[PDB]
Nucleic acid binder design. Structure first.
Length: 111
DNA sequence: ATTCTGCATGGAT
DNA sequence: TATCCATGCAGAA
């Protein structure tokens, strides 16, 4: 029974990502790199656990963009606001190996 | 007015 | 020139 937390990537929140809309933008590069692959514009549900138990479930989804894709987690506001985040705070996504569990955390604006 | 969608745009680099 | 994500924006309800 030997486990490790492996950083995947971080996102520093925009107005949009922090705002009322509820969708958080993932750099395409990063999404394809560390989240499941998905081939439909409307993706798959994705359960990410926070440090203190709470499973959040977002639809992980893309759209066509230019000739590529734009990625988002949808329905984040509950998660965000539980964690008290504003634009300029940072959300870190990580993976627990061996296994494929997705976990997350966040930290507050530099100031 | 408002919110949800599903993109499309274009400023930043 | 190029990429590409923050934000715009036009339905639909």
């Amino acid at each position: 029974l030997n486990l490790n937390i492996v950083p995947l990537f971080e996102k520093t929140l925009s107005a949009s990502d922090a705002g009322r809309i509820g969708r958080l933008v993932l750099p395409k590069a990063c999404a394809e790199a560390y989240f499941p692959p998905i081939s439909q514009s409307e993706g798959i549900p994705l359960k990410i656990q926070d440090v203190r138990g709470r499973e959040w479930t977002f639809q992980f989804r893309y759209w066509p963009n230019n000739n590529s894709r734009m990625y988002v987690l949808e329905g984040v506001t509950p998660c965000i606001q539980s964690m008290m985040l504003q634009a300029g705070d940072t959300v870190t996504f990580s993976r627990v190996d061996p296994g494929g569990k997705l976990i997350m955390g966040s930290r507050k604006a530099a100031n």
